[PDB]
Swiss-Prot record:
Gene that specifies this protein: LYZ
Disease field: Amyloidosis, hereditary systemic 5: A form of hereditary systemic amyloidosis, a disorder characterized by amyloid deposition in multiple tissues resulting in a wide clinical spectrum. AMYLD5 primarily affects the viscera, and the predominant clinical features are renal dysfunction of varying severity, and intra-abdominal bleeding. Inheritance is autosomal dominant.
Biological role: Lysozymes have primarily a bacteriolytic function; those in tissues and body fluids are associated with the monocyte-macrophage system and enhance the activity of immunoagents.
Listed name of the protein: Lysozyme C
Enzyme Commission number: 3.2.1.17
C-type lysozyme domain residues: 1-130
Cystine residue pairs: 6-128, 30-116, 65-81, 77-95
Source organism per UniProt: Homo sapiens
Length: 130
């Protein structure tokens, strides 16, 4: 499913992401925009280390979800990677909460450091009534 911007903002709000480990909703919205363009079906295979990034947050199969074909997989979210390609994002959100409980927090996603850190990200939630 490709979410509309404010549709996603209200869904993340309902799922308890606003201020989760000190991370505002606008920061989570900036991350989903640049990771997938708010598309739950997004996958990206990384040929160099043989891992794939899944779903709206592009969560990686080496560390977080299990797809059975990645070398060294840890599966810290204890989730099948197919659970991150659903239209329903409650599982992708429970795994994203797990990722940021590590000390790096949202910095775990490089795309957040490149496109969202130290920028004004408030336009991602403006007008959504969130």
């Amino acid at each position: 499913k490709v979410f509309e911007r404010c549709e996603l903002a209200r869904t993340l709000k309902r799922l308890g992401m606003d201020g989760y480990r000190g991370i505002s909703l606008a920061n989570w919205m900036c991350l989903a925009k640049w990771e997938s363009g708010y598309n739950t079906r997004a996958t990206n295979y990384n040929a160099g280390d043989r891992s794939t990034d899944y779903g709206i947050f592009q969560i990686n199969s080496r560390w977080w979800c299990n797809d059975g074909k990645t070398p060294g997989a840890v599966n810290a979210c204890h989730l099948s990677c197919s659970a991150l390609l659903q239209d329903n994002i409650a599982d992708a959100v429970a795994c994203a909460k797990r990722v940021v409980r590590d000390p790096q927090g949202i910095r775990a996603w490089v795309a957040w450091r490149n496109r969202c850190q130290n920028r004004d990200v408030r336009q991602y939630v403006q007008g959504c009534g969130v």
